[PDB]
Amino acid sequence: MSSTQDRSQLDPEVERHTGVDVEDVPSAEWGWSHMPIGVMHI
Amino acid sequence: MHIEARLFEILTAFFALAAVVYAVLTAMFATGGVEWAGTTALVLTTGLTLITGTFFRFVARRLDTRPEDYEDAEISDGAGELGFFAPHSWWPILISLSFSTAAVGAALWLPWLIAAGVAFVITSVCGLVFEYYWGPEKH
């Protein structure tokens, strides 16, 4: 119990609405989280 | 732990008999007397089983019958606080890698790599052992 729950306001800016989702990558909103599969295929 | 001790007691009896008969029938009826390899191996596996069985017997006499060792024991009897079992840990793989480094250093006779692998083994074993005792950072 010698710990304090953290809370953070990260300045956001693509709107992560076409791509990866928190269900697939839990921290999608926290950073670059998805590379187009076309990039990996090519 | 009566049966647990008795298993090793039986193994010790058999291995002692095997060592004695091997030693006798090799001291006589062999090309060069006692073999001194099979004899020693049999004697010290008798010692293996003897040590384990003696400890188990000490424990059995020191312990009252557990639910595990007690026929006709209900689950609620043993229900209670089980002890600490280590959750997830990534120190075992580091220990294995350090020992592998030391092993390749021994195979390819590289004393520098042997020293590095031994240092890494010390570090990784220290990490594993201290994993659940390292206190919080004091700043």
């Binding site: - | 062999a30 090309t31 060069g32 073999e35």
Partner: protein, 312 residues
């Protein structure tokens, strides 16, 4: 029927080989009887399918049959004890160690070929005033008065005061039938006589096995120091002709290229061969002189080339 039931065991050429083959036939008969009954049990309990007529009623659920367990743990002991008694009586004639061998062959096996010395020959009928040489058994005692240090060490040697590079255990003889990589060695032995083999290895363990002797031994580097009874005897060799022999323990890379021959010839042929070898001649020359093919007829010294696809 015996040949087929022997599972590809060559018909022996020695009394020991014949006796071993008979024991093998008996043991295989016993093993096949046991296997037949057990396979019958398995294929008969495979008739206990889950019959659709089986209603909501589980099987007899018995387990735990003490008398049956006792019977089936008594009978295997009887079977294996009979087999052990037969094994012991056959083993007794594995090395009779007759102190009067009729011909002694010093078989020294080095890395990837053989050499045969003809240590001694003493025919019972009376012949062959022959003997081994042994002037060349020279030791390698590293008993220098002083080593690197100034004094005190006076090192004698690592092992029993000698050096591992000793080779004194090896024995050498006047007539050496050394086998070259391109010439398969052909140890020639008289038929009908008792042949002792004194077995040794120059470098590494390997195994002298004449498949038609129905017997192999492991030529070790220092059998006497390893408590190994390298020397072993054969009471007789009835059939004449060339018999292949092979290496049957790991020698190195060319472990499969150590094949040799044990050509059994008549006693008069052996007389002529040994006389012609005492006279300056090679093994092939002596064989040709006694009118027998010089080169190993059961095997060839096959290609020294590493393989087929190597560009010559």
């Amino acid at each position: 029927w015996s040949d087929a039931l022997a599972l590809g065991w060559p018909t022996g050429i020695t009394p020991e080989a014949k006796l071993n083959r008979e024991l093998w036939i008996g043991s295989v008969i016993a093993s096949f009887a046991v296997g037949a009954i057990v396979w019958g049990l398995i294929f008969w309990t495979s008739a206990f399918h889950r019959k659709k007529a089986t209603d909501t009623e589980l099987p007899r659920q018995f387990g735990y049959n003490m008398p049956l367990e006792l019977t089936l743990t008594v009978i295997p002991f009887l079977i294996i004890s009979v087999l052990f008694y037969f094994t012991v009586v056959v083993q007794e004639r594995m090395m009779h160690k007759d102190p009067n061998p009729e011909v002694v062959i010093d078989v020294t096996a080095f890395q990837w070929n053989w050499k045969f010395g003809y240590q001694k020959i003493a025919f019972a009928d009376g012949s062959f005033d022959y003997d081994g040489a042994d002037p060349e058994r020279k030791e390698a005692m590293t008993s220098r008065p002083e080593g690197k240090d100034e004094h005190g060490i006076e090192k004698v040697g690592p092992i029993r005061g000698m050096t591992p590079e000793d080779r004194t255990y090896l024995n050498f003889d006047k007539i050496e039938t050394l086998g070259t990589s391109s010439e398969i060695p052909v140890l020639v032995l008289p038929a009908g006589k008792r042949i002792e083999f004194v077995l040794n290895s120059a470098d590494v363990i390997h195994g002298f096995w004449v498949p038609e002797f129905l017997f192999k031994r492991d030529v070790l580097p220092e059998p006497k120091a390893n408590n190994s009874d390298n020397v072993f005897q054969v009471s007789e060799i009835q059939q004449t002709g060339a018999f292949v022999g092979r290496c049957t323990e790991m020698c190195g890379t060319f472990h499969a290229m150590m094949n040799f021959e044990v050509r059994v010839v008549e006693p008069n042929d052996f007389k002529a061969y040994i006389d012609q070898r005492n006279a300056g001649k090679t093994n092939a020359e002596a064989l040709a002189a006694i009118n027998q093919p010089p080169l190993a007829i059961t095997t060839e010294p096959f290609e020294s080339r590493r393989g087929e696809l190597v560009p010559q």
